[PDB]
């Protein structure tokens, strides 16, 4: 619904596929597939996934598995859905307490804001949440997390400039000691990835691991959806260095770049867990791969 709006422009642009398929027959296959390829590329499906999708269609058309435009269209949706769920999209918090979640990302992605929206969700499900203001680089983020703490009725551990790993260590200790269900940890926001940032994220992961075996449970990377395919290198860097368990794609408002969602998940094998489709608190939503594929293809 809100996912339909989040990618409204992608849907509009991908609609050309239905028109092209009106002109499909076996002899027209390669011409139709050339146009279909161009349409996916226009909507920010990466080259690797576009060729994979198109060549499989061509295969299945040639072998006689696919015999009509409607069958080809549904096969296209199936290929895309399969790349998305090749996926545990849910938060994987287990049973041992406390669960520890780290939120990471660069400036402009809504890192801190999403952590607040997430805390709202968990609080509403009756989960006992402690916040940790580990974004030590940005003073405005810490203050914003105190505002979120007050709105959602979470307690919050704040820095007393602090080392993020020390704040997180403190919050998780208090989590465990005071019987919390989840410790929800912010981390430092920078304009671009750099060495200093990666070193600090490594330290935070080690520091919370020392207090609770297997912590953190989730390391969620927040990314502005509007960056499209340019999010691939950065997600790969966070993943190679830190180990990301889930993505949060934000700032979607009739994005024309919906293909980037499939491209990132397929490339790195990290599921999209939440999508941000608006500025209200409820507008951070659990990702539903089948609903998404319907939202972009009809």
Curated annotation (Swiss-Prot):
Top-level taxon: Eukaryota
A single GO BP term for this record reads: SRP-dependent cotranslational protein targeting to membrane
Which of UniProt's keywords are assigned here?
Chloroplast, GTP-binding, Membrane, Metal-binding, Nucleotide-binding, Plastid, Receptor, Thylakoid, Transit peptide
Induction info: Not induced by light or iron.
This protein's membrane topology, according to the annotation, is: Peripheral membrane protein
Cellular component terms per the entry's GO annotation: chloroplast stroma; chloroplast thylakoid membrane
Q: Where along the chain is GTP bound?
A: 105-112, 186-190, 250-253
Query: Key word 4Fe-4S present in the record?
Result: no
The consequence of inactivating this gene is: Seedling lethal.
S-S bridge residues: none
UniProt GO MF annotations:
ATP hydrolysis activity; GTP binding; metal ion binding
Q: What is the effect of changing residue 7 to V/A/L?
A: Reduced interaction with FFC, but no effect on the basal GTPase activity
Q: Describe tissue expression.
A: Expressed in green tissues. Low levels in roots and seeds.
Compartments reported by the entry: Plastid, Chloroplast stroma; Plastid, Chloroplast thylakoid membrane
Q: What else is known?
A: Unlike eukaryotic or prokaryotic signal recognition particle (SRP), the chloroplast SRP from higher plants lacks an SRP-RNA component. It targets both chloroplast-encoded and nucleus-encoded substrates to the thylakoid membrane, post-translationally for the nucleus-encoded proteins and co-translationally for the chloroplast-encoded proteins.
User: What's the domain remark here?
Assistant: The N-terminal domain (39-56) is necessary and sufficient for thylakoid binding.
Q: Which family does it belong to?
A: Belongs to the GTP-binding SRP family.
- Provide the function of this protein: Signal recognition particle receptor protein. Binds GTP specifically. The GTPase activity is inhibited by the N-terminus of the protein until binding to the thylakoid membrane. Activates the GTPase activity of FFC/cpSRP54 when bound to the cpSRP complex. Required for light-harvesting chlorophyll a/b-binding protein (LHCP) integration into thylakoids. Might be also functionally linked to the Sec translocation machinery.
Summary of subunit composition and partner proteins:
Monomer. Interacts with FFC/cpSRP54, a component of the cpSRP complex, composed of a FFC/cpSRP54 monomer and a CAO/cpSRP43 dimer. The complex with FFC/cpSRP54 is formed when both proteins are bound with GTP.
Protein name, UniProt field: Cell division protein FtsY homolog, chloroplastic
What's the source species for this entry?
Answer: Arabidopsis thaliana (Mouse-ear cress)
Q: What's the gene?
A: CPFTSY
Which residues of the full-length protein are shown here?
Answer: 65 to 366 of 366
């Amino acid at each position: 619904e809100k996912v339909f709006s989040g990618f409204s422009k992608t849907r509009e642009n991908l609609a050309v596929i239905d028109e092209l398929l009106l002109f499909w027959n076996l002899a027209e296959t390669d011409r139709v597939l050339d146009e279909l390829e161009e349409a996916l590329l226009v909507s920010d499906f990466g080259p690797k996934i576009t060729v994979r999708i198109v060549e499989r269609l061509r295969e299945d058309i040639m072998s006689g598995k696919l015999k009509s435009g409607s069958e080809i269209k549904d096969a296209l949706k199936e290929s895309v859905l399969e790349m998305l769920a090749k996926s545990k999209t849910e938060l994987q918090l287990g049973f041992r307490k406390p669960a520890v979640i780290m939120i990471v990302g660069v400036n402009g992605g809504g890192k801190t804001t999403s952590l607040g929206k997430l805390a709202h969700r968990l609080k509403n499900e009756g989960t006992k949440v402690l916040m940790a203001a580990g974004d030590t680089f940005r003073a405005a983020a810490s203050d914003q997390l105190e505002i979120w703490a007050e709105r959602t009725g979470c307690e919050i551990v704040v820095a007393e400039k602090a080392k993020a790993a020390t704040v997180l260590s403190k919050a998780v200790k208090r989590g465990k000691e005071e019987g919390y269900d989840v410790v929800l940890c912010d981390t430092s926001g920078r304009l671009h990835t750099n060495y200093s940032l990666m070193e600090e994220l490594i330290a935070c992961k080690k520091a919370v691991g020392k207090i609770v075996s297997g912590a953190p449970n989730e390391i969620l990377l927040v990314l502005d959806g509007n960056t499209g395919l340019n999010m691939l290198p950065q997600a790969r860097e966070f993943n190679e260095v830190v180990g990301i368990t889930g993505l949060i794609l934000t700032k979607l408002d009739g994005s024309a770049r919906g293909g980037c969602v499939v491209s990132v998940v397929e490339e790195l094998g990290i599921p999209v867990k939440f999508i941000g489709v608006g500025e209200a608190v409820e507008d951070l939503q659990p990702f539903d791969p089948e609903a998404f594929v319907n939202a972009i293809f009809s």
